Design a protein around this nucleic acid. Sequence first.
DNA 1: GCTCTACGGATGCCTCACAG
DNA 2: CTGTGAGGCATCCGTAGA
Length: 595
Amino acid sequence: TFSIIDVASDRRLFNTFIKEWKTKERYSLALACEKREHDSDGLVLIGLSVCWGARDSYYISLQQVSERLGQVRSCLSRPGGVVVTYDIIQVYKTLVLSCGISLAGNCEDPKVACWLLDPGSEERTLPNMVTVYCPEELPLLDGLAHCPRVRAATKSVLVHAVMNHLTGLLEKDSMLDLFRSIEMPSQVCLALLELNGVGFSVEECERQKHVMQAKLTALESQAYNLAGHSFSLTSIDDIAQVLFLELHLPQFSTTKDILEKLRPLHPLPGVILEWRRITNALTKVVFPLQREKQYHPTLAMDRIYPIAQTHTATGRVSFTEPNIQNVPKDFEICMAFSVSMRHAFVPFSGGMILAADYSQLELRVLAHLSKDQRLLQVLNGGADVFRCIAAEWKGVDPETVNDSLRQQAKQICYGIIYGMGAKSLGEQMGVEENDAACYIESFKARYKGINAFLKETVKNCIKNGYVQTLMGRRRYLPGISNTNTHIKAHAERQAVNTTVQGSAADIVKLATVNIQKRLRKTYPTAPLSHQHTLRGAFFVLQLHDELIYETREEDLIQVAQIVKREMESAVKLYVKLKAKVKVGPSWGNLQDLDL
DNA sequence: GCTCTACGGATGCCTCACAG
DNA sequence: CTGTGAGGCATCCGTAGA
Ligand SMILES: Nc1nc2c(ncn2[C@H]2C[C@H](O)[C@@H](COP(=O)(O)OP(=O)(O)OP(=O)(O)O)O2)c(=O)[nH]1
Ligand SMILES: [Mg+2]
């Protein structure tokens, strides 16, 4: 019954297809691109194929008129009417960049359902899905020359069948409400983030690169003079020589975090550390971005377009190649220059970067999950828990806690929460093994609800094989009952961390979706992204709790109000989700906006 | 006895042509 | 006949963000 009839061949047939399509509560949509060139209509994208069910596929050719594209735009932009596509983000970007079509409404992606049912598994290709979840369609795998009219039909029907199976599988696991309402709208928001791209000035990048390269030459001159000869800084053998071979205390694994008893006294290891950061910064941001930089003519600027992965074990969002998330924070260079690779990321003319970062997000989520009344009452009163942790660690007043010293407190807190042992805590605090063990013991005793939550999460993981987040995501950890102690402990730490961190990721995704909905309510006429062609915000980057939006100068205040309200009202918990909003002329130049 | 990501570089065995 | 350099991947680790 596998049919590939072409609806876009007759006027009346196409009209009947459209009128039956607008009433379909759930259909499957597939791209059909004959990519003769690497983002066009009739040259790259050839058409769209549809599938309502019962092994039926209808093809809408975008080749040799525009009324078909107009009606497809009407159907795809809020015709119920859930459209399921394979790799929704790339499909959304292709539709936008080829025809300016925005998928508005309810969208679904079988990859997202497969990753919900097994976050730690491998990213199943569509045939891999048909060979696992829906074996009853294997003979249809033939059809993926490519002939994008047949590959699209086969992909659409297979995606429809696979998503129908995954719908029942999610209903069994009680993830369908989370999948339909939170996971997929977050994917559409990430597609909008990829379409927008983050602004990027080469002029700032060029001057930062020039200063960094001058510093690299100076550092090489120092290192070749500090030791006595001219070695190679990119080969581990040379660093394992001189250091650990002449005077320094230890093949030898010359890496970071051995700063103790090495970086003091002889200053060579500090120079090597600075050289390695600046070199990593260059070769992983500056060079990759200066070759991945693209020119937006309408904005008359340069933009970096990242690619989101979203197949994360804990529910986070990552980015490949450009790695805008991993762009380093500002660091100082002495003769003093300030390498701010984020400062190279800029809004359009007459616009401002707006960044809203969740304040102690995972602490609040852990307080809600554990129902720990102590933590709840501490963090509902406006107190900064990380500041107090740093203060009690160092004995200084909490109001005088450095941001760098607060990062160590954050690391200590989250590590203790997520299974850090006594040796690692001693390393990260400088205290002895016994002192670190007593610190973890008193931490669990003080926050009784948190320790009870950890033990109960481990026990329920052993009983069920999986852990669950605040909004229903399950991660299966078969190693929880493994006989080997190391694997069992790793699975325990992963279980607790997945619970809390996946809950935080769910909260962040829902906050992003709510912000986007409110922004579209407030600015219905604004463009959805920078590739749809001003007013509103644009969501140029996501930092796992932080949302960079790149708003207009006059709309800054209203956008900040909207963003703060939505990030605080995303989910109703026993905690308050205090969001910290900053604005500035650049990503690397942001000032706190107490609004 | 922190977790997550990507990613490149590094190990670390497994196997195949191969030259003796 | 057979060790074997080489290659061939398969993962592990370090490092930057979070
Ligand atoms: N296990 C672990 N998770 C971390 C660590 N640093 C950050 N994370 C996770 C937990 C945080 O809730 C989440 C968001 O990142 P941030 O570092 O910006 O922290 P948060 O928003 O919690 O606090 P702050 O923003 O400083 O008030 O990242 C770390 O050192 N260890
Ligand atoms: Mg934060």
